[PDB]
Copies of this chain bind each other. A is one copy, B any other.
Amino acid sequence: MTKALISIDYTEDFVADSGKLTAGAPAQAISDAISKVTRLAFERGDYIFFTIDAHEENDCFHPESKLFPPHNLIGTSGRNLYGDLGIFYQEHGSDSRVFWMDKRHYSAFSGTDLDIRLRERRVSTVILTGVLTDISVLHTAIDAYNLGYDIEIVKPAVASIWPENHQFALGHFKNTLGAKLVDENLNELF
């Protein structure tokens, strides 16, 4: 069956050394795996959803503005996809199976039309990749669970700034959400 891979916030501001809200080394370490798994999913016929923070510096009505420094600002290089994943987007961004969705909350579902697009395509399984494991990925996974999706987490293609938080989230995915943990070849991990 055809699935959907969700690419969560893997942008310059979350990954690069000078990124405004960078997760640093652990985020950079998944660059090869996240691009590889995305290409693999696309090649086999899956839908690809880039779900990307789209913030505005002067937005005092957003509770998040008080919690983190400005990041992924609309019209800035901070929103550019990091590494070879960006090259994949140059090659296939205009394809009918590839989507770019701006989001304001951590979850890829919140205030977006992600659920609608998935339901149009009768997709029952989402495959999650990106950063941070315990924030945008976690919120997306919980929303996916409540919306009745089967969930796959690409373990080597998610990362957090805190190793303990990364480990909590992975445990939560498997034990509470019943997610399948998979590698960069989309093979289950035992």
Q: Which chain B residue shows the least CB distance to A175?
A: B67
In the complex, A43 has a CB within 8 A of chain B:
no
| CB pair A121 B164 closer than 8 Å | no
A133: min CB distance to chain B, Å: 11
Shortest beta-carbon distance from A34 to chain B in Å: 22
For the side of the interface on A, what is the size category?
35 or more
> Interface stretch among A4-12, A16-24, A80-88, A104-112?
A104-112
A111 engages B116 (CB within 8 Å): yes
CB interface residues, A 99-150, toward B, < 8 Å: 104-107, 110-113, 115-117, 119-122, 124, 134-135, 139, 142-143, 145-148
With an 8 A cutoff between CB atoms, is A165 at the interface?
yes
Task: Tell me which of B63, B116, B121, B135 contacts A178 (CB under 8 A).
Answer: B63
How many copies of this protein are present in the complex?
4
With beta carbons under 8 angstroms apart, the residue of B67, B146, B168 that contacts A165 is B168
Nearest chain B CB to A19 CB, angstrom units: 18
Q: What is the bound-complex CA distance between A140 and B121, given in angstroms?
A: 22
Chain A residues with a Cβ under 8 A of chain B: 58, 61-64, 66-67, 96, 104-107, 110-113, 115-117, 119-122, 124, 134-135, 139, 142-143, 145-148, 164-165, 168, 171-172, 175-176, 178
